[PDB]
Nucleic acid binder design. Structure first.
Ligand SMILES: [Zn+2]
Ligand SMILES: [Zn+2]
Ligand SMILES: [Zn+2]
Lengths: 296, 102, 186, 72, 187
RNA sequence: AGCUGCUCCCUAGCAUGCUACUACCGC
RNA sequence: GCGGUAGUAGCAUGCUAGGGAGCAG
């Protein structure tokens, strides 16, 4: 129960076949269901045919019968089309405004994040839509990283190298620290706690986080956390105040931040300022001189 | 047979779950309790009939605030209900007269 | 329900019969409009009956699912509503014995046990600062829960007993301030 | 006046119980005992002293942020 | 109901009706095309309404037998679970002492309230207070049911381990006090 | 997490019944 | 002009089934 993605109108409908299951308003949800292959919608109850042993998942084939949603041949004589007026049946019916341009969010929902144009879309669409672009992008590739094989150790040659087998069917991830693995100790009960290592080819050289001795048969996986939708947009709107509000200036300054002080004069007067941070010019010097200028 | 008024009021106030801290979701239990707490309306003691009258007024408030809440979430109301009988004594009087209508 | 297509045909038939009965010409020519008008209320009250029940069907289903949504949103927030309701009732209660300990806990005097009610029995009240000490403990008497207790075993946080006369403002920044001031009721 | 005491005792024991206070058997026994005395009380003063004795249990804990929930 | 032998015939009858109505030759033509719509209507009366009931009947039967199939699957699952529970709990009881106690019965039928008494390999005491603790489980060893037991793993209401030195007289009011002492059968 | 008994509310179905409209059939 | 049957809609009663809630021992 909340607001949809494009319209932000209060709604109760969530696209089942969609990546991250977002809220959608009635007309907005229908616009998604016809402009994508996402043919599943999930309100406070599931929109499926509740007669025993049915498999229909699209909403159009569904019709309301009594206290449920029914398919073509399972309905009673009394029925009603859930998909009518270009707005699917749902809570908060009238308070839906619809979105004129939905194809952007259809593209993001059908996106596989393969080409650069996917990222161009991810940053060109609107505020919560592009936050959702980030949500879906990440969600996709954590669903990706565990679709690779498991690094099951076979032999212990020596220190810093091992022998690695990988499960049949799914490929081997790249051989860098880009894909940080994590291990657990396989026992008679379950798997517990090795730690994060990254593997390269020797023989399989293993770069372990901590010191540790491994044996035969222990395997590591590329773990993912539980990614939960953000609240705020990427950054707050800009506002240039008249003066440094809420802050008390310093009394005297050291030389090594003079070119920095005549800088903090302006980040202090408005809220944000992107810093062209060329490598190694005193960047963390810039950071500490903020506190040197404002200690409290 | 009239019940013990404290029993009726205690059933009104003290409940389980959380569903029942909100009258709108239930209503029907107040209908049943007002059905049970009717015969106090003929009791000479004044502070007994007021229990029944309070129950009637509370049912009325529950109904016409549920209609408002549904009206403000949606934009139309319950096209027809014929629910007035619930907040009038004619409905409850029927259940203590010898003519069964099951 | 008047915006249905069959209503127009019914209206045309009714106008035709009104004209016929206003003229009163034939016996069978108007009888045509009992084989064409008595039908006109057959595809009208058949189409305007089912839609009217469909309206109430939709209304009842919507109300059911709204109630289900409210029921799922209520039983998932109990452990904030209970506390809000409790504190509103407490501030409505208006009893000094309560307000004293509520304010004291709002600034720090949290007891480390159940407050005993007998004339005997022990109490321990954390005191984290000195300004808090000024209001509560005066000399040998401890004022708390609108009662009169007797101060006996002041102690610092490193488990070292600290004497009573030592407690003063200048030497206050010399002690592990989370004092545990054990006492007994009057 | 006493009815307010009984109702707030019910609410207080509810919040304490959902505060996982029943994992310490002696604590829960004391709380339940005090609740049952308050509910069966016939005069308002002992009700209030048992009330403050009960409230002290919640006050001693550090789960209910007090300066917030007393926003007035 | 659109692909039945009757849709064609009704369509032909109505096609003749409309063709000769546009022609509009005779009153007998209207009578014939009315008595044709008034008989070919019976065709769409039963050909498309009694078969409209057979579908309801067939669906009812199909769902009924679906429900019965699920009914007969749950039986197999509960049977497997019950037999596994029986065969896994049996494994703990058959000590040799059970054989020794049953073989000495005059018949082979021994009372039930003496099987755990003379065969159980672990005793569980529950003590409400220290006074009862002193007369039952004092010390590391104690005798019940004419046997010799030795104490280990003393616990309390919160199920936290409590060592034997803690339970004095003065320390007693500081313990959750349905203390549950478990003991082994010494030999 | 028990066994009954009474009462309210909603929906579904079948059957019955009642009433109205249309068609067929002879009389 | 009548009867009967076939239809369709509406209504009532009752019986069964399913769900929700309340009282009494
Ligand atoms: Zn989608
Ligand atoms: Zn929308
Ligand atoms: Zn189906």
């Amino acid at each position: 129960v909340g607001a949809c993605v494009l319209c932000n109108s209060q709604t109760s409908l969530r696209c089942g076949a969609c990546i991250r299951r977002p809220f959608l308003c009635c007309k907005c949800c229908y616009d998604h269901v016809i402009s994508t292959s996402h043919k599943l919608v999930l309100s406070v109850n599931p929109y499926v045919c509740n007669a025993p042993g049915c498999d229909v998942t699209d909403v159009t084939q569904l019709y309301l019968g009594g206290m449920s949603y029914y398919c073509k041949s399972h309905k009673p004589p009394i029925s009603f089309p859930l998909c009518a007026n270009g707005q699917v049946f749902g809570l908060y019916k009238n308070t839906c405004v619809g979105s004129d341009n939905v194809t952007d969010f259809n593209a993001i929902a059908t996106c596989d994040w393969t080409n650069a144009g996917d990222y161009i879309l991810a940053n060109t669409c609107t505020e919560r839509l592009k936050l959702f672009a980030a949500e879906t992008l990440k969600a996709t590739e954590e669903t990706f990283k565990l679709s690779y094989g498991i690094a099951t150790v076979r032999e212990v040659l020596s220190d810093r190298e091992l022998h690695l087998s990988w499960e049949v069917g799914k490929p081997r991830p790249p051989l860098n620290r880009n894909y940080v693995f994590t291990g657990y100790r396989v026992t008679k009960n379950s798997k517990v706690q090795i730690g994060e290592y990254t593997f390269e080819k020797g023989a399989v050289v293993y770069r372990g986080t901590t010191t540790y001795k491994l044996n035969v048969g222990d395997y590591f996986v590329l773990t993912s956390h539980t990614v939960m939708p953000l609240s705020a947009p990427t950054l707050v709107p800009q506002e240039h105040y008249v003066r440094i509000t809420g802050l008390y200036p310093t009394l005297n300054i050291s030389d090594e931040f003079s070119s920095n002080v005549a800088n903090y004069q302006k980040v202090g007067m408005q809220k944000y300022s992107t810093l062209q941070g060329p490598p190694g010019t005193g960047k963390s010097h810039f950071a500490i001189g903020l506190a040197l200028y404002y200690p409290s | 047979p009239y019940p013990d008024p404290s029993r009726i009021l205690g059933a009104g106030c003290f409940v389980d779950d959380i569903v029942k801290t909100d009258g709108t979701l239930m209503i029907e239990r107040f209908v049943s309790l007002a059905i049970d707490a009717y015969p106090l309306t003929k009791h000479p003691n004044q502070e007994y009939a007021d229990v029944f009258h309070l129950y009637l007024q509370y049912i009325r408030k529950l109904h016409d605030e549920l209609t408002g809440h549904m009206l403000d979430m949606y934009s139309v109301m319950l096209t027809n209900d014929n629910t007035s009988r619930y907040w009038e004594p004619e409905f409850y009087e029927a259940m203590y007269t010898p003519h069964t209508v099951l | 329900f008047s915006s249905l297509p069959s209503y127009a045909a019914f209206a045309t038939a009714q106008e035709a019969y009104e004209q016929a009965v206003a003229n009163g010409d034939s016996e069978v020519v108007l009888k045509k409009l009992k084989k064409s008008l008595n039908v006109a209320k057959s595809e009208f009250d058949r189409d305007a009956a089912m839609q009217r029940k469909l309206e109430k069907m939709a209304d009842q289903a919507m109300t059911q699912m709204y109630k289900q949504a409210r029921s799922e949103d209520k039983r998932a927030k109990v452990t904030s509503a209970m506390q809000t309701m409790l504190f509103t009732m407490l501030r409505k209660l208006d009893n000094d014995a309560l307000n004293n300990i509520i304010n004291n806990a709002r600034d720090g005097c949290v007891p480390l046990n159940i407050i005993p009610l007998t004339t005997a029995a022990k109490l321990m009240v954390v005191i984290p600062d000195y300004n808090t000490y000024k209001n509560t403990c005066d000399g040998t008497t401890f004022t708390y829960a609108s009662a009169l207790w007797e101060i006996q075993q002041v102690v610092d946080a490193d488990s070292k007993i600290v004497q009573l006369s030592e407690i003063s403002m200048d030497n206050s920044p010399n002690l592990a301030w989370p004092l545990i001031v054990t006492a007994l009721r009057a | 006046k006493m009815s307010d005491v009984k109702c707030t005792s019910v609410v207080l024991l509810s919040v304490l119980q959902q505060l996982r206070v029943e994992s310490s058997s002696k604590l829960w026994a004391q709380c339940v005992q005090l609740h049952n005395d308050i509910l069966l009380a016939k005069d308002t003063t002992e009700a209030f002293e048992k009330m403050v004795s009960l409230l002290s249990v919640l006050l001693s804990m550090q789960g209910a942020v007090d300066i917030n929930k007393l926003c007035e």
